[PDB]
């Protein structure tokens, strides 16, 4: 692929503020603290999530980090150091900075004020210029960034300006939880990334990342945007080769927001053109978790695959990751394997269902009826056995051959029969 | 090579010595340092041309083989006798080298270094400098694919990349 040879040059040499540090020695499902650690460096640091992080383990180190950035709110990261009782001696540039920044914020709302009064076209580009500065170095004033990035947005040096700047409006708003602003610079990135800039092999590379940031944690209507994201640069499960790849977790997400908002028919080009392509093949050896519903749906296993799925339930129900949609996952994981497994059936047992699963015979019965009361599955139950049978063993193919072939011959030879 | 391991630029100049030195005057020092490297070339060319056109049952054909060795000792004296502004531009030539000495070695020797038992094996500092040597041409293999995104010789880049794909 073109822009994977851009990519192969490079390896991987991402150009990430953090630079490569991140929360040492952690403990349960090393994959998900492996996962956090290469999201937390390529979203230049969340803040929010390690809270998150700390709620599922107990880490100190949090603090770490926590204390070394102050634009999340300078009171905010002085009082959780000074609960924890880290002795700094060494918070002394914020009285300073913080009152530079508040003369700077008022005699600039004074022409704030004054160039929206008069409208003139070169003072409000001499205001929004000598704003820009003031809100790249502290946008924390986050309300008075959204105001400056409502109206304009551009300023003489404009792809590189305009374009951190829709990342750090949709990374602002999307820490302090204003989801509106957040979709809507989620929208806003989306239409910014066609035209494009100078593409230089990093820049498309973080440009891929960030889309995969705003679109990955789920709040409204993010099927949709995994819909926007699949054929944008055309299905990848990962968008970058380079053997190094691990974002690991967005074809679990992705999977899903097919099951629960389209028909499965479907997930056969899933498997092949997602699931079966190099990018995933690196991936799934550094996901068995992921490997495991993977393999077990394209072996067809009835009794390995179903308490291997259910034992991959109690990690996934303890996945403290945002996706909103967690037992619609689940459900329909428990459904999706069923339906696989029922495509090419004779018989089921109801009872053999149930323990497998941990349900009681009935729960079961009324389960696959729900399969039958969709059109998931065709069948008979037996009453007194308690067994559903198949039998889709169609005979007679003759029939649907000679419908096509004598009906547009004859009707074509009946169109000659006129001149 | 051990006499010009021996000097380091004695009779060179450098205006230093000149009464009777110069290695920078007929004429330019950097110039005749890379010139060994083209003095060693010809023994390069003449040692394919044979074993080109020796039989391919012949004892003598066994034989050529064992002075393959030989010739990447002297590239590897070479290598460590550069000398940054001589690399930079006998780099493209030198990573072809490397390739010509590593584009069809077989699985033996890979197998040795990653299957035999670490508890039992070099614990050592001989052999910490040797099989270190041997994985020197994948660790340079991966700098020069990003020296090379500075070059334009296109037909070294995709002959180079084709080996790398052979190295993998």
């Given at each position: 692929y073109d822009l994977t040879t851009r990519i192969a040059h490079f390896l991987d040499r991402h150009l990430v503020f953090p630079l490569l540090e991140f929360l040492s020695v952690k403990e349960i499902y090393n994959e998900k603290e492996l996962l956090q650690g290469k999201l937390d460096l390529l979203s230049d640091t969340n803040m929010v999530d390690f809270a998150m992080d700390v709620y599922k383990n107990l880490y100190s180190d949090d603090i770490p980090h926590a204390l070394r950035e102050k634009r999340t709110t300078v009171v905010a990261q002085l009082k959780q150091l000074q609960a924890e009782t880290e002795p700094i001696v060494k918070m002394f540039e914020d009285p300073e900075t913080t009152r530079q920044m508040q003369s700077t914020r008022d005699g600039r709302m004074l022409f704030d004020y004054l160039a929206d009064k008069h409208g003139f076209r070169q003072e409000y580009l001499d205001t929004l210029y000598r704003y820009a500065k003031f809100q790249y170095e502290c946008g924390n004033y986050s309300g008075a960034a959204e105001y400056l990035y409502f109206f304009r947005v551009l300023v003489p040096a404009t792809d590189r300006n305009a374009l951190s700047s829709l990342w750090g409006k949709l990374a602002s708003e999307i820490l302090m939880q204003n989801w509106d602003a957040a979709m809507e610079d989620l929208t806003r990135l989306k239409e910014t990334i066609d035209n494009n800039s100078v593409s230089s092999p990093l820049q498309s590379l973080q440009q891929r990342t960030w889309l995969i940031h705003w679109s990955l944690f789920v709040f409204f209507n993010h099927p949709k945007g995994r819909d926007n994201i699949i054929d944008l640069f055309l299905?990848?499960?990962?968008?970058?080769?380079?053997?190094?790849?691990?974002?690991?977790?967005?074809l679990r997400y992705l999977t899903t927001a097919v099951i629960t908002n389209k028909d499965v028919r479907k997930r056969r080009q899933v498997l092949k053109d997602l699931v079966k392509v190099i990018q995933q093949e690196s991936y799934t050896y550094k996901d068995p978790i992921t490997e495991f519903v993977e393999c077990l749906y394209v072996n067809f296993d009835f009794d390995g695959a179903q308490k291997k799925l259910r034992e991959c339930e109690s990690v996934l129900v303890n996945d403290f990751f945002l996706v909103a949609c967690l037992e619609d996952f689940i459900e329909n994981a428990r459904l999706f394997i069923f339906e696989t497994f029922c495509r090419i059936h004779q018989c089921i047992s109801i009872n053999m269902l149930a323990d497998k699963l941990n349900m009681t015979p009935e729960e079961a019965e009324r389960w696959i009826v729900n399969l039958i009361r969709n059109a998931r599955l065709d069948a008979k139950i037996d009453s007194k056995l308690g067994h559903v049978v198949m039998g889709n063993?169609?005979?007679?193919?003759?029939q649907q051959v000679i419908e096509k072939t004598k009906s547009l011959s004859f009707r074509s030879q009946m169109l000659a029969m006129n001149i | 090579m051990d006499i010009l391991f021996a000097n380091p630029n004695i009779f060179v100049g450098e205006n230093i010595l000149e009464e009777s030195e110069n290695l920078q005057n007929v004429d330019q020092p950097l110039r005749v340092r890379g010139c060994i490297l083209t003095l060693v070339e010809r023994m390069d060319e003449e040692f394919t041309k044979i074993m080109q056109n020796t039989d391919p049952h012949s004892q003598e054909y066994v034989e050529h083989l064992k002075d393959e060795a030989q010739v990447c000792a002297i590239i590897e004296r070479v290598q460590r006798y550069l000398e940054e502004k001589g690399t930079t531009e006998e780099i493209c030539r030198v990573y072809l080298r490397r390739i010509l000495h590593t584009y069809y070695k077989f699985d033996y020797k890979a197998h040795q270094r990653q299957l035999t038992p670490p508890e039992g094996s070099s614990k050592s500092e001989q052999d910490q400098a040797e099989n270190e040597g041997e994985d020197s041409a994948v660790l340079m293999e991966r700098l020069c694919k990003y020296i090379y995104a500075k070059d334009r010789t296109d037909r070294i880049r995709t002959c180079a990349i084709l080996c790398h794909i052979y190295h993998h």
């Amino acid at each position: 692929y073109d822009l994977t040879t851009r990519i192969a040059h490079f390896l991987d040499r991402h150009l990430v503020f953090p630079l490569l540090e991140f929360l040492s020695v952690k403990e349960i499902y090393n994959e998900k603290e492996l996962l956090q650690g290469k999201l937390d460096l390529l979203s230049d640091t969340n803040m929010v999530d390690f809270a998150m992080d700390v709620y599922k383990n107990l880490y100190s180190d949090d603090i770490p980090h926590a204390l070394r950035e102050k634009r999340t709110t300078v009171v905010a990261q002085l009082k959780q150091l000074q609960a924890e009782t880290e002795p700094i001696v060494k918070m002394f540039e914020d009285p300073e900075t913080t009152r530079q920044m508040q003369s700077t914020r008022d005699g600039r709302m004074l022409f704030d004020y004054l160039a929206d009064k008069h409208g003139f076209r070169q003072e409000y580009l001499d205001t929004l210029y000598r704003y820009a500065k003031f809100q790249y170095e502290c946008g924390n004033y986050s309300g008075a960034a959204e105001y400056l990035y409502f109206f304009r947005v551009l300023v003489p040096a404009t792809d590189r300006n305009a374009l951190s700047s829709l990342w750090g409006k949709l990374a602002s708003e999307i820490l302090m939880q204003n989801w509106d602003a957040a979709m809507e610079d989620l929208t806003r990135l989306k239409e910014t990334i066609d035209n494009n800039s100078v593409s230089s092999p990093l820049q498309s590379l973080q440009q891929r990342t960030w889309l995969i940031h705003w679109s990955l944690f789920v709040f409204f209507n993010h099927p949709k945007g995994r819909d926007n994201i699949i054929d944008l640069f055309l299905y990848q499960p990962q968008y970058l080769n380079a053997i190094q790849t691990m974002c690991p977790h967005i074809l679990r997400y992705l999977t899903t927001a097919v099951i629960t908002n389209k028909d499965v028919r479907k997930r056969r080009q899933v498997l092949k053109d997602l699931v079966k392509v190099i990018q995933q093949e690196s991936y799934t050896y550094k996901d068995p978790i992921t490997e495991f519903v993977e393999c077990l749906y394209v072996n067809f296993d009835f009794d390995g695959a179903q308490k291997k799925l259910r034992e991959c339930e109690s990690v996934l129900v303890n996945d403290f990751f945002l996706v909103a949609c967690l037992e619609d996952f689940i459900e329909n994981a428990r459904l999706f394997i069923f339906e696989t497994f029922c495509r090419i059936h004779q018989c089921i047992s109801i009872n053999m269902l149930a323990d497998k699963l941990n349900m009681t015979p009935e729960e079961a019965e009324r389960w696959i009826v729900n399969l039958i009361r969709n059109a998931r599955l065709d069948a008979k139950i037996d009453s007194k056995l308690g067994h559903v049978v198949m039998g889709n063993n169609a005979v007679s193919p003759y029939q649907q051959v000679i419908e096509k072939t004598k009906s547009l011959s004859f009707r074509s030879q009946m169109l000659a029969m006129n001149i | 090579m051990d006499i010009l391991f021996a000097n380091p630029n004695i009779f060179v100049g450098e205006n230093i010595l000149e009464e009777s030195e110069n290695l920078q005057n007929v004429d330019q020092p950097l110039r005749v340092r890379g010139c060994i490297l083209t003095l060693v070339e010809r023994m390069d060319e003449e040692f394919t041309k044979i074993m080109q056109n020796t039989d391919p049952h012949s004892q003598e054909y066994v034989e050529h083989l064992k002075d393959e060795a030989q010739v990447c000792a002297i590239i590897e004296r070479v290598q460590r006798y550069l000398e940054e502004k001589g690399t930079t531009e006998e780099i493209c030539r030198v990573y072809l080298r490397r390739i010509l000495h590593t584009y069809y070695k077989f699985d033996y020797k890979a197998h040795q270094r990653q299957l035999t038992p670490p508890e039992g094996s070099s614990k050592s500092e001989q052999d910490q400098a040797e099989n270190e040597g041997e994985d020197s041409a994948v660790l340079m293999e991966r700098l020069c694919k990003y020296i090379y995104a500075k070059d334009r010789t296109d037909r070294i880049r995709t002959c180079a990349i084709l080996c790398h794909i052979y190295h993998h």
